[PDB]
Structure formats: C-alpha cells, structure tokens
JSON list of C-alpha atoms (C1' of nucleotides) in Angstrom, two decimals:
[
{"chain": "A", "resi": 333, "resn": "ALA", "atom": "CA", "xyz": [319.22, 118.08, 182.98]},
{"chain": "A", "resi": 334, "resn": "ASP", "atom": "CA", "xyz": [318.61, 115.34, 185.24]},
{"chain": "A", "resi": 335, "resn": "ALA", "atom": "CA", "xyz": [318.39, 112.70, 182.41]},
{"chain": "A", "resi": 336, "resn": "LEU", "atom": "CA", "xyz": [321.52, 114.17, 180.62]},
{"chain": "A", "resi": 337, "resn": "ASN", "atom": "CA", "xyz": [323.53, 114.05, 184.10]},
{"chain": "A", "resi": 338, "resn": "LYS", "atom": "CA", "xyz": [322.45, 110.46, 184.47]},
{"chain": "A", "resi": 339, "resn": "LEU", "atom": "CA", "xyz": [323.66, 109.81, 181.16]},
{"chain": "A", "resi": 340, "resn": "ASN", "atom": "CA", "xyz": [327.11, 111.31, 182.02]},
{"chain": "A", "resi": 341, "resn": "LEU", "atom": "CA", "xyz": [328.49, 112.02, 178.55]},
{"chain": "A", "resi": 342, "resn": "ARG", "atom": "CA", "xyz": [332.39, 112.16, 178.55]},
{"chain": "A", "resi": 343, "resn": "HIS", "atom": "CA", "xyz": [333.90, 115.63, 178.33]},
{"chain": "A", "resi": 344, "resn": "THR", "atom": "CA", "xyz": [330.32, 117.23, 178.45]},
{"chain": "A", "resi": 345, "resn": "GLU", "atom": "CA", "xyz": [328.62, 119.34, 181.05]},
{"chain": "A", "resi": 346, "resn": "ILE", "atom": "CA", "xyz": [324.94, 120.32, 181.01]},
{"chain": "A", "resi": 347, "resn": "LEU", "atom": "CA", "xyz": [323.95, 124.04, 181.10]},
{"chain": "A", "resi": 348, "resn": "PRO", "atom": "CA", "xyz": [320.43, 125.48, 181.68]},
{"chain": "A", "resi": 349, "resn": "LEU", "atom": "CA", "xyz": [318.78, 128.93, 180.79]},
{"chain": "A", "resi": 350, "resn": "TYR", "atom": "CA", "xyz": [315.60, 130.31, 181.67]},
{"chain": "A", "resi": 351, "resn": "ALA", "atom": "CA", "xyz": [313.74, 133.48, 182.85]},
{"chain": "A", "resi": 352, "resn": "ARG", "atom": "CA", "xyz": [313.81, 133.04, 186.52]},
{"chain": "A", "resi": 353, "resn": "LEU", "atom": "CA", "xyz": [317.53, 132.06, 186.38]},
{"chain": "A", "resi": 354, "resn": "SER", "atom": "CA", "xyz": [320.33, 133.60, 188.61]},
{"chain": "A", "resi": 355, "resn": "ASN", "atom": "CA", "xyz": [322.19, 136.48, 187.20]},
{"chain": "A", "resi": 356, "resn": "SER", "atom": "CA", "xyz": [325.44, 134.77, 188.12]},
{"chain": "A", "resi": 357, "resn": "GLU", "atom": "CA", "xyz": [324.30, 131.55, 186.25]},
{"chain": "A", "resi": 358, "resn": "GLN", "atom": "CA", "xyz": [323.26, 133.67, 183.36]},
{"chain": "A", "resi": 359, "resn": "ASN", "atom": "CA", "xyz": [326.61, 134.99, 183.21]},
{"chain": "A", "resi": 360, "resn": "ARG", "atom": "CA", "xyz": [328.24, 131.48, 183.59]},
{"chain": "A", "resi": 361, "resn": "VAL", "atom": "CA", "xyz": [326.21, 130.53, 180.41]},
{"chain": "A", "resi": 362, "resn": "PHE", "atom": "CA", "xyz": [328.23, 133.60, 178.74]},
{"chain": "A", "resi": 363, "resn": "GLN", "atom": "CA", "xyz": [331.63, 132.65, 180.02]},
{"chain": "A", "resi": 364, "resn": "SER", "atom": "CA", "xyz": [334.12, 130.09, 178.40]},
{"chain": "A", "resi": 365, "resn": "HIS", "atom": "CA", "xyz": [334.78, 126.55, 179.28]},
{"chain": "A", "resi": 366, "resn": "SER", "atom": "CA", "xyz": [336.74, 123.50, 178.18]},
{"chain": "A", "resi": 367, "resn": "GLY", "atom": "CA", "xyz": [335.13, 120.72, 176.31]},
{"chain": "A", "resi": 368, "resn": "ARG", "atom": "CA", "xyz": [331.23, 120.73, 175.28]},
{"chain": "A", "resi": 369, "resn": "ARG", "atom": "CA", "xyz": [328.26, 122.30, 177.07]},
{"chain": "A", "resi": 370, "resn": "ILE", "atom": "CA", "xyz": [324.68, 121.18, 176.36]},
{"chain": "A", "resi": 371, "resn": "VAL", "atom": "CA", "xyz": [322.41, 124.10, 176.88]},
{"chain": "A", "resi": 372, "resn": "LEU", "atom": "CA", "xyz": [318.72, 123.69, 177.70]},
{"chain": "A", "resi": 373, "resn": "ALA", "atom": "CA", "xyz": [316.98, 126.95, 177.03]},
{"chain": "A", "resi": 374, "resn": "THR", "atom": "CA", "xyz": [313.64, 128.67, 176.59]},
{"chain": "A", "resi": 375, "resn": "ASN", "atom": "CA", "xyz": [312.05, 131.67, 174.84]},
{"chain": "A", "resi": 376, "resn": "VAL", "atom": "CA", "xyz": [314.57, 133.69, 176.57]},
{"chain": "A", "resi": 377, "resn": "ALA", "atom": "CA", "xyz": [317.36, 132.30, 174.47]},
{"chain": "A", "resi": 378, "resn": "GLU", "atom": "CA", "xyz": [314.75, 132.30, 171.65]},
{"chain": "A", "resi": 379, "resn": "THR", "atom": "CA", "xyz": [314.21, 136.00, 171.75]},
{"chain": "A", "resi": 380, "resn": "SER", "atom": "CA", "xyz": [316.67, 138.09, 173.97]},
{"chain": "A", "resi": 381, "resn": "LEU", "atom": "CA", "xyz": [319.99, 136.72, 175.32]},
{"chain": "A", "resi": 382, "resn": "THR", "atom": "CA", "xyz": [321.60, 135.31, 172.12]},
{"chain": "A", "resi": 383, "resn": "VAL", "atom": "CA", "xyz": [323.79, 132.65, 173.78]},
{"chain": "A", "resi": 384, "resn": "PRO", "atom": "CA", "xyz": [327.18, 132.28, 172.09]},
{"chain": "A", "resi": 385, "resn": "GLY", "atom": "CA", "xyz": [329.11, 129.37, 170.83]},
{"chain": "A", "resi": 386, "resn": "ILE", "atom": "CA", "xyz": [326.24, 127.27, 169.70]},
{"chain": "A", "resi": 387, "resn": "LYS", "atom": "CA", "xyz": [326.95, 124.82, 166.85]},
{"chain": "A", "resi": 388, "resn": "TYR", "atom": "CA", "xyz": [323.53, 123.03, 166.57]},
{"chain": "A", "resi": 389, "resn": "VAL", "atom": "CA", "xyz": [320.06, 123.42, 167.63]},
{"chain": "A", "resi": 390, "resn": "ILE", "atom": "CA", "xyz": [317.18, 121.02, 168.77]},
{"chain": "A", "resi": 391, "resn": "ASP", "atom": "CA", "xyz": [313.68, 122.32, 168.16]},
{"chain": "A", "resi": 392, "resn": "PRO", "atom": "CA", "xyz": [310.90, 120.06, 169.69]},
{"chain": "A", "resi": 393, "resn": "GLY", "atom": "CA", "xyz": [308.55, 122.75, 168.37]},
{"chain": "A", "resi": 394, "resn": "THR", "atom": "CA", "xyz": [306.95, 123.21, 171.66]},
{"chain": "A", "resi": 395, "resn": "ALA", "atom": "CA", "xyz": [306.34, 126.13, 173.76]},
{"chain": "A", "resi": 396, "resn": "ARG", "atom": "CA", "xyz": [303.89, 127.47, 176.44]},
{"chain": "A", "resi": 397, "resn": "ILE", "atom": "CA", "xyz": [302.26, 130.62, 175.02]},
{"chain": "A", "resi": 398, "resn": "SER", "atom": "CA", "xyz": [300.10, 132.96, 177.25]},
{"chain": "A", "resi": 399, "resn": "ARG", "atom": "CA", "xyz": [296.34, 133.10, 176.43]},
{"chain": "A", "resi": 400, "resn": "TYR", "atom": "CA", "xyz": [293.28, 134.74, 177.70]},
{"chain": "A", "resi": 401, "resn": "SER", "atom": "CA", "xyz": [289.73, 133.46, 176.82]},
{"chain": "A", "resi": 402, "resn": "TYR", "atom": "CA", "xyz": [286.22, 134.73, 177.42]},
{"chain": "A", "resi": 403, "resn": "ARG", "atom": "CA", "xyz": [284.74, 131.58, 178.93]},
{"chain": "A", "resi": 404, "resn": "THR", "atom": "CA", "xyz": [287.12, 131.38, 181.76]},
{"chain": "A", "resi": 405, "resn": "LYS", "atom": "CA", "xyz": [287.92, 135.08, 182.16]},
{"chain": "A", "resi": 406, "resn": "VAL", "atom": "CA", "xyz": [291.30, 133.95, 183.36]},
{"chain": "A", "resi": 407, "resn": "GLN", "atom": "CA", "xyz": [294.68, 134.06, 181.91]},
{"chain": "A", "resi": 408, "resn": "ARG", "atom": "CA", "xyz": [296.13, 130.67, 181.05]},
{"chain": "A", "resi": 409, "resn": "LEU", "atom": "CA", "xyz": [299.35, 129.60, 179.40]},
{"chain": "A", "resi": 410, "resn": "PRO", "atom": "CA", "xyz": [298.77, 126.45, 177.22]},
{"chain": "A", "resi": 411, "resn": "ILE", "atom": "CA", "xyz": [301.61, 124.17, 175.77]},
{"chain": "A", "resi": 412, "resn": "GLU", "atom": "CA", "xyz": [301.10, 124.83, 171.87]},
{"chain": "A", "resi": 413, "resn": "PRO", "atom": "CA", "xyz": [303.33, 124.24, 168.85]},
{"chain": "A", "resi": 414, "resn": "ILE", "atom": "CA", "xyz": [305.59, 127.13, 167.90]},
{"chain": "A", "resi": 415, "resn": "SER", "atom": "CA", "xyz": [304.96, 128.86, 164.78]},
{"chain": "A", "resi": 416, "resn": "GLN", "atom": "CA", "xyz": [306.68, 128.94, 161.34]},
{"chain": "A", "resi": 417, "resn": "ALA", "atom": "CA", "xyz": [308.48, 132.09, 162.36]},
{"chain": "A", "resi": 418, "resn": "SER", "atom": "CA", "xyz": [309.42, 130.86, 165.66]},
{"chain": "A", "resi": 419, "resn": "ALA", "atom": "CA", "xyz": [310.64, 127.84, 164.24]},
{"chain": "A", "resi": 420, "resn": "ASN", "atom": "CA", "xyz": [312.60, 129.93, 161.69]},
{"chain": "A", "resi": 421, "resn": "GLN", "atom": "CA", "xyz": [314.00, 132.05, 164.70]},
{"chain": "A", "resi": 422, "resn": "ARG", "atom": "CA", "xyz": [315.12, 128.93, 166.60]},
{"chain": "A", "resi": 423, "resn": "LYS", "atom": "CA", "xyz": [316.46, 127.50, 163.53]},
{"chain": "A", "resi": 424, "resn": "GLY", "atom": "CA", "xyz": [318.66, 130.81, 162.97]},
{"chain": "A", "resi": 425, "resn": "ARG", "atom": "CA", "xyz": [319.90, 130.81, 166.45]},
{"chain": "A", "resi": 426, "resn": "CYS", "atom": "CA", "xyz": [322.80, 128.46, 165.70]},
{"chain": "A", "resi": 427, "resn": "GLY", "atom": "CA", "xyz": [324.53, 129.88, 162.53]},
{"chain": "A", "resi": 428, "resn": "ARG", "atom": "CA", "xyz": [326.42, 132.53, 164.26]},
{"chain": "A", "resi": 429, "resn": "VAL", "atom": "CA", "xyz": [330.12, 131.37, 164.58]},
{"chain": "A", "resi": 430, "resn": "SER", "atom": "CA", "xyz": [329.85, 128.43, 161.88]},
{"chain": "A", "resi": 431, "resn": "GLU", "atom": "CA", "xyz": [327.75, 125.89, 160.08]},
{"chain": "A", "resi": 432, "resn": "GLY", "atom": "CA", "xyz": [324.54, 125.11, 161.85]},
{"chain": "A", "resi": 433, "resn": "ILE", "atom": "CA", "xyz": [322.00, 122.18, 161.80]},
{"chain": "A", "resi": 434, "resn": "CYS", "atom": "CA", "xyz": [318.51, 122.41, 163.31]},
{"chain": "A", "resi": 435, "resn": "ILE", "atom": "CA", "xyz": [317.23, 119.01, 164.16]},
{"chain": "A", "resi": 436, "resn": "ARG", "atom": "CA", "xyz": [313.25, 119.46, 164.58]},
{"chain": "A", "resi": 437, "resn": "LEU", "atom": "CA", "xyz": [311.48, 116.49, 166.51]},
{"chain": "A", "resi": 438, "resn": "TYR", "atom": "CA", "xyz": [308.43, 116.75, 164.35]},
{"chain": "A", "resi": 439, "resn": "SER", "atom": "CA", "xyz": [307.44, 116.56, 160.56]},
{"chain": "A", "resi": 440, "resn": "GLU", "atom": "CA", "xyz": [307.88, 118.99, 157.61]},
{"chain": "A", "resi": 441, "resn": "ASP", "atom": "CA", "xyz": [304.31, 118.60, 156.95]},
{"chain": "A", "resi": 442, "resn": "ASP", "atom": "CA", "xyz": [303.40, 119.59, 160.55]},
{"chain": "B", "resi": 1, "resn": "U", "atom": "C1'", "xyz": [175.67, 23.99, 293.94]},
{"chain": "B", "resi": 2, "resn": "G", "atom": "C1'", "xyz": [171.81, 17.64, 292.73]},
{"chain": "B", "resi": 3, "resn": "C", "atom": "C1'", "xyz": [171.46, 16.60, 286.91]},
{"chain": "B", "resi": 4, "resn": "C", "atom": "C1'", "xyz": [173.14, 17.32, 281.74]},
{"chain": "B", "resi": 5, "resn": "A", "atom": "C1'", "xyz": [168.86, 11.63, 276.42]},
{"chain": "B", "resi": 6, "resn": "U", "atom": "C1'", "xyz": [170.96, 8.60, 271.72]},
{"chain": "B", "resi": 7, "resn": "G", "atom": "C1'", "xyz": [174.50, 8.27, 267.29]},
{"chain": "B", "resi": 8, "resn": "U", "atom": "C1'", "xyz": [177.51, 11.39, 264.70]},
{"chain": "B", "resi": 9, "resn": "A", "atom": "C1'", "xyz": [183.67, 13.98, 259.75]},
{"chain": "B", "resi": 10, "resn": "C", "atom": "C1'", "xyz": [190.76, 13.93, 257.70]},
{"chain": "B", "resi": 11, "resn": "G", "atom": "C1'", "xyz": [194.69, 13.63, 252.71]},
{"chain": "B", "resi": 12, "resn": "U", "atom": "C1'", "xyz": [202.17, 11.93, 248.58]},
{"chain": "B", "resi": 13, "resn": "C", "atom": "C1'", "xyz": [207.22, 14.93, 244.52]},
{"chain": "B", "resi": 14, "resn": "G", "atom": "C1'", "xyz": [209.70, 16.35, 239.02]},
{"chain": "B", "resi": 15, "resn": "C", "atom": "C1'", "xyz": [213.50, 20.39, 233.65]},
{"chain": "B", "resi": 16, "resn": "A", "atom": "C1'", "xyz": [217.98, 21.61, 230.21]},
{"chain": "B", "resi": 17, "resn": "C", "atom": "C1'", "xyz": [222.52, 24.40, 226.34]},
{"chain": "B", "resi": 18, "resn": "U", "atom": "C1'", "xyz": [223.86, 25.75, 221.42]},
{"chain": "B", "resi": 19, "resn": "C", "atom": "C1'", "xyz": [227.62, 26.94, 215.58]},
{"chain": "B", "resi": 20, "resn": "A", "atom": "C1'", "xyz": [235.33, 25.51, 212.67]},
{"chain": "B", "resi": 21, "resn": "A", "atom": "C1'", "xyz": [238.98, 26.54, 207.83]},
{"chain": "B", "resi": 22, "resn": "U", "atom": "C1'", "xyz": [237.10, 27.57, 199.95]},
{"chain": "B", "resi": 23, "resn": "A", "atom": "C1'", "xyz": [241.07, 31.36, 192.57]},
{"chain": "B", "resi": 24, "resn": "G", "atom": "C1'", "xyz": [242.77, 33.73, 189.13]},
{"chain": "B", "resi": 25, "resn": "U", "atom": "C1'", "xyz": [247.27, 37.85, 188.01]},
{"chain": "B", "resi": 26, "resn": "C", "atom": "C1'", "xyz": [253.61, 36.52, 182.47]},
{"chain": "B", "resi": 27, "resn": "A", "atom": "C1'", "xyz": [257.30, 40.18, 181.73]},
{"chain": "B", "resi": 28, "resn": "G", "atom": "C1'", "xyz": [259.97, 44.97, 182.64]},
{"chain": "B", "resi": 29, "resn": "U", "atom": "C1'", "xyz": [267.08, 46.86, 177.24]},
{"chain": "B", "resi": 30, "resn": "U", "atom": "C1'", "xyz": [272.65, 48.88, 178.71]},
{"chain": "B", "resi": 31, "resn": "U", "atom": "C1'", "xyz": [275.21, 52.33, 181.71]},
{"chain": "B", "resi": 32, "resn": "U", "atom": "C1'", "xyz": [276.01, 56.85, 185.08]},
{"chain": "B", "resi": 33, "resn": "C", "atom": "C1'", "xyz": [277.81, 60.72, 188.20]},
{"chain": "B", "resi": 34, "resn": "U", "atom": "C1'", "xyz": [276.29, 62.23, 193.16]},
{"chain": "B", "resi": 35, "resn": "G", "atom": "C1'", "xyz": [280.23, 62.34, 199.24]},
{"chain": "B", "resi": 36, "resn": "U", "atom": "C1'", "xyz": [283.25, 65.47, 202.51]},
{"chain": "B", "resi": 37, "resn": "U", "atom": "C1'", "xyz": [286.95, 68.93, 207.22]},
{"chain": "B", "resi": 38, "resn": "U", "atom": "C1'", "xyz": [290.23, 71.79, 207.38]},
{"chain": "B", "resi": 39, "resn": "U", "atom": "C1'", "xyz": [293.27, 76.88, 208.94]},
{"chain": "B", "resi": 40, "resn": "U", "atom": "C1'", "xyz": [288.80, 79.67, 211.55]},
{"chain": "B", "resi": 41, "resn": "U", "atom": "C1'", "xyz": [290.80, 86.75, 213.25]},
{"chain": "B", "resi": 42, "resn": "U", "atom": "C1'", "xyz": [286.68, 88.31, 207.75]},
{"chain": "B", "resi": 43, "resn": "U", "atom": "C1'", "xyz": [290.07, 93.96, 210.01]},
{"chain": "B", "resi": 44, "resn": "U", "atom": "C1'", "xyz": [292.35, 97.89, 211.96]},
{"chain": "B", "resi": 45, "resn": "U", "atom": "C1'", "xyz": [292.98, 106.57, 209.95]},
{"chain": "B", "resi": 46, "resn": "U", "atom": "C1'", "xyz": [295.33, 109.87, 206.81]},
{"chain": "B", "resi": 47, "resn": "U", "atom": "C1'", "xyz": [297.49, 114.31, 204.04]},
{"chain": "B", "resi": 48, "resn": "U", "atom": "C1'", "xyz": [299.70, 119.04, 201.29]},
{"chain": "B", "resi": 49, "resn": "U", "atom": "C1'", "xyz": [304.57, 118.63, 195.20]},
{"chain": "B", "resi": 50, "resn": "U", "atom": "C1'", "xyz": [306.12, 122.77, 190.46]},
{"chain": "B", "resi": 51, "resn": "U", "atom": "C1'", "xyz": [308.13, 127.19, 187.15]},
{"chain": "B", "resi": 52, "resn": "U", "atom": "C1'", "xyz": [306.48, 130.40, 178.17]},
{"chain": "B", "resi": 53, "resn": "U", "atom": "C1'", "xyz": [307.46, 134.87, 178.45]},
{"chain": "B", "resi": 54, "resn": "U", "atom": "C1'", "xyz": [308.30, 140.15, 177.93]},
{"chain": "B", "resi": 55, "resn": "U", "atom": "C1'", "xyz": [307.83, 146.28, 178.13]},
{"chain": "B", "resi": 56, "resn": "U", "atom": "C1'", "xyz": [305.81, 150.96, 181.41]},
{"chain": "B", "resi": 57, "resn": "U", "atom": "C1'", "xyz": [307.17, 159.51, 182.53]}
]
RNA sequence: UGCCAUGUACGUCGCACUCAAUAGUCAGUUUUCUGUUUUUUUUUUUUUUUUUUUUUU
C-alpha cells in the first residue's frame, strides 16, 4: 500500500483487506466507488469474503500456513508456496463479473 | 844538717773515570641506494519495532 501510494496512479485508489481489518473498512471494500481500486488481500479473500467487482488477479504464490512440529513443540506459521488447489482458487476468484486474467509471479514448472 | 868519684843516647810526604746512528715487500674491474620533523588529545555509555488463517451445545 505504501509503495502504490508513493507511485500515485491516476484515478486509482489503494484498498486493503485482511483478517484483523475493521468491520467498517471491510464494508468499505464492499461498497461502490468511481474509477479503479487496487485491492491487496489475503487468505480471507481467498476463502471467505468473495470481494466483488474484480477483473484481474495477481498470485505471487505465497502464503503463511500454520504448522506444528515435534522438535520445537510450538505452533509456527512459516511462509510456504501455495498449493495447486490454492492457486486454482486464487485464479478462479476473478471470473465473477467478466473475463479474468491471473498473473502468477512464478513459473509453470514450479 | 858537713859530703855526694870519672865518662856516658834522638829522626822528612804521594792516586784516577769509562761506551753514538746498518734491507727487502708490484698491483687491487664498473656502478649503487641509504637521510629526516611535523600536527602531537591516541578517546569519551546505551536501548526496546510487527500482524496466514479459520470453526465450537
């Protein structure tokens, strides 16, 4: 968000979404606008909220995932590449209203 | 308190100071660094920093 607001794209506003987000802000994601909104979201939008009015989707293929190992006896949440099913879900999150394009910031072999 | 017999033997002398000067043996390639003063103090205690994610009579 700071990088995009430093970029200052014309007729474009920057909109976040995550789990700890305010209820009012989560409704402001849902409300209308004028122009283009670049939404930066997480597994919340991957799974639950179904943010509307999205044309294209960027998948870096990256998510923290909870984990619990026997050596450390402690819950961790490492940064791991998302699955094929997670990639397919993030891909399908954009073809709701019209034609969708999923730009994945990694390789097809990967 | 009177007397004491006669002749009877002599000379001259020495001492010192000393002694010097002597044989043969030629030569050693070119070039080089090395070098000097001056400000001096070198050294002084620090700190809290980010967030997958989702459900429970």
